[PDB]
Amino acid sequence: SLSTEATAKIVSEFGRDANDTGSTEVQVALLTAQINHLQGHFAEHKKDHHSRRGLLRMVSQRRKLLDYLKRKDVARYTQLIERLGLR
Amino acid sequence: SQITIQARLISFESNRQQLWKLMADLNTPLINELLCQLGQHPDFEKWQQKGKLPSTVVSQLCQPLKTDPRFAGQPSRLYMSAIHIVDYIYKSWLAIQKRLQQQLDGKTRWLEMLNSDAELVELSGDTLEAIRVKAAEILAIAMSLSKTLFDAYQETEDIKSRSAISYLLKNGCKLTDKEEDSEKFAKRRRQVEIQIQRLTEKLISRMPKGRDLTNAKWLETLLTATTTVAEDNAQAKRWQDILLTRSSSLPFPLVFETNEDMVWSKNQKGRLCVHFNGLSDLIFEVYCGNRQLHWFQRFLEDQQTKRKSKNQHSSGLFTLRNGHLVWLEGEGKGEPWNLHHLTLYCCVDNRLWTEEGTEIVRQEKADEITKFITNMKSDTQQALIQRKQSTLTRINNSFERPSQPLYQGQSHILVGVSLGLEKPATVAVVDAIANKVLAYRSIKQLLGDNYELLNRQRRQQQYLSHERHKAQKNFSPNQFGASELGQHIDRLLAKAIVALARTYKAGSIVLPKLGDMREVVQSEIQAIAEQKFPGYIEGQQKYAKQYRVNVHRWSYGRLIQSIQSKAAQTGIVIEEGKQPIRGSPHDKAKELALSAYNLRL
RNA sequence: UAAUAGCGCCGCAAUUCAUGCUGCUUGCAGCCUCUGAAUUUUGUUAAAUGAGGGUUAGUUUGACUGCAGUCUUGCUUUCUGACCCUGGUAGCUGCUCACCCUGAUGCUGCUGUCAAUAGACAGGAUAGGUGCGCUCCCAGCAAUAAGGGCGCGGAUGUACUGCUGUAGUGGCUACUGAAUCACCCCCGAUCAAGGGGGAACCCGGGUUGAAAGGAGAAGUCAUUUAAUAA
């Protein structure tokens, strides 16, 4: 999981305000940060079954948050997809 | 009659690495030739109807793949190994699918035929006695019986009077006076519905898969799933089912179906050596215990005897039949050809060891070859008849071999073996003309000094099943079971039963027609559980877990095979019969042997 | 302190016969000295089973020829013995927790010493409960079965381990510590390789624990853990 400094850094950049402790922008971005650190270890440690359970959960949460945001506000959804480099 | 023996093969790296590269490259056209049938072939459903693969189709898909830029680097015998394996994959899977189709139809009949006594009265517009009288007429006509009554319902609807033919069939081809409980009938008719449902589910099977070593689909899916967003729950789960899949680490084995495509020799150091057709640069050294060496010396003696005799003796009687070359998985780190272990598995027909046994195979093949030539009687077909007639002539010229008189047993003395859940075996030796049991054995006698091993097997199954549960919750790789102990116990009983058959000069060993006990129990416990937990499907599955699990762990097919193998190596005939539903394990064994004796005529 | 009960095994004791023991009537009479089946009983320095994790191309189960002489190979497994350990730091990574109640196929349970902090040190497979074990039971913990209660902030168009967080417990890779044995001791080789020196006993030769094998491919089933979903 992320360092304390790394969470504070991510929440301050994707949060709409410093007090925006849990917007979808924040949650999706944090998940994207974790997933980007976990694919670099899981491509090397191919025998590490316990980490594939962690990855498949963490990707599936990201998708639910994104589907919710898409219907809620397509402009927020489009910007968030850009800022995270997703397709 | 056949057995498999084995040795590890030793060579220097360059040879174990070159062979790996050919098998990692050969493993791939074993995948592509599956796909060329799995989805490419248009006739596929005609094969599923017939239950058999056409004898040339895999070769006709492989021949143009021999020049493929991906597959072209391999010897002519490695392509025949590919064609062999893919032929045997499909030739097995289609034959599984056909027996399932036949069972589903063969019970869809019976779910239509099975009616309550009140339904027969309504359907006939007549009395249940009129039905008993017509059932008595139908038995008088018939006297193949159960089949003849099934056929007489499939034919001969007879103004619905086939109602009485169903009355016979549900009563086990006999007349019955009693009138049945509709609750017992409801359980009975529900078991058939469950079997029908289960068969309509199992009717669809996963199209036989190739062993992909590349990880390419898995790596592509990983980078897709982590960098892109799925458009559907079905797509997000499609990536999950791929990412959870464990990939293979070993290529398919080479199969050498011609015994002469292995060449044997003796090394300067006195060790035995082998080489394969198309790999004749790569000499390998045999390493095996002296408990098995006598076959590997016999391989070289069979070969030298033919070569010393200007090919006038045939490999139609060579002790080696076919070889399967396989990489057994090693442990720890290293390149695959330094980590895994080349092992050569030789199929051997054990009755070729002796001269008296070789003469059986000479007569068996000479009769089969003679019939083949007379069934055949075109250009290459004449060349095939030249192969056959050179065999039919050469097979009469004998190898110098060990002599041992054949076993002979008394045609009236039989060993009955009774299998069950609590007693894996129990034995009665019957003199069938005296109607006299010569001896009985229970398990405590039937493996003697080893009787502690049954208690060990039950402790180990229970202990290890709990440890596997605890280990899975922690994602530990440690996953172990009693399978090799169960295999040893089934072999101890197989030796003791045949030693007992030899002791009393028995003419045969009798084994029960157990059939598919696992599916039968699964349907019976479900039809019952649905009456005790209606609507609560989780409670229905929990109803008798330990009984259903103990039936799925019951090794009856492996004990039946272990006895068959050891009996046929000794020369004792195997016979079969219905095992009684009631009586003690001894009475079951007694009546089983007497039933198999009564079935002689 | 506690663990009374339930369930599975292990013998011990009968009681009933036989697949057994004496006869000739080759099928009866007779009993339980053995060898075995069935029921019921038991927990007695009775007897018998008895899963903390690991270690040898180990020994014996082998082939051929008339029980004697030749040849012999180190494969895949099941036990019985014996010995060793109860681990080390260097990264990567999963899960779990605001705080409470219920407490799960949940974790933990040995001897001795110092602390009496939660942990070190030295012993060790006798290691919570019984003759021996369990998903059962007792004791402590319980966030990491599950359900319910519910505080402040973020979001609030259905998404929300999504906040209150530095520890707990796993997974994997690289290096490393001990045993690398089959009567002990010593020097080596692990796709190969053996050799040298002793103790004990039997009648200068042996002995110094036994046993099994028909192998591959593919589909399918049952339970059992994870993930997703309604």
Author numbering:
A (entry chain S): 2 to 88
B (entry chain O): 2 to 144, 173 to 406, 412 to 635
Question: What does the article say, verbatim?
Answer:
CRISPR-associated transposons (CAST) are programmable mobile genetic elements that insert large DNA cargos using an RNA-guided mechanism. CAST elements contain multiple conserved proteins: a CRISPR effector (Cas12k or Cascade), a AAA+ regulator (TnsC), a transposase (TnsA–TnsB) and a target-site-associated factor (TniQ). These components are thought to cooperatively integrate DNA via formation of a multisubunit transposition integration complex (transpososome). Here we reconstituted the approximately 1 MDa type V-K CAST transpososome from Scytonema hofmannii (ShCAST) and determined its structure using single-particle cryo-electon microscopy.
Because particles containing 12 TnsC protomers were most frequently observed (73% of particles used in final refinement) and yielded a slightly higher resolution cryo-EM map (3.5 Å versus 3.7 Å), we refer to this configuration as the major configuration. Aligning both transpososome reconstructions (major and minor configurations) on the basis of TnsB reveals an additional TnsC protomer (TnsC13) next to Cas12k in the minor configuration, which contains an additional TnsC protomer compared with the major configuration (12 TnsC protomers). Correspondingly, Cas12k is rotated by approximately 60° in the minor configuration (solid surface) compared with the major configuration (transparent surface). Comparing the two configurations, the specific TnsC–DNA interactions in protomers adjacent to TnsB are virtually identical, since the same interactions are made at the same positions on the target DNA substrate. At first glance, the TnsC–DNA contacts adjacent to Cas12k also appear similar. However, these contacts are shifted over by one nucleotide in the minor configuration compared with the major configuration. That is, the last two TnsC protomers in both configurations interact in the same way with TniQ, resulting in a translational shift of TnsC–DNA interactions. This leads to slight variability in the number of base pairs contacted by TniQ (5 bp (major configuration) versus 4 bp (minor configuration)) and TnsC (30 bp versus 31 bp, respectively).
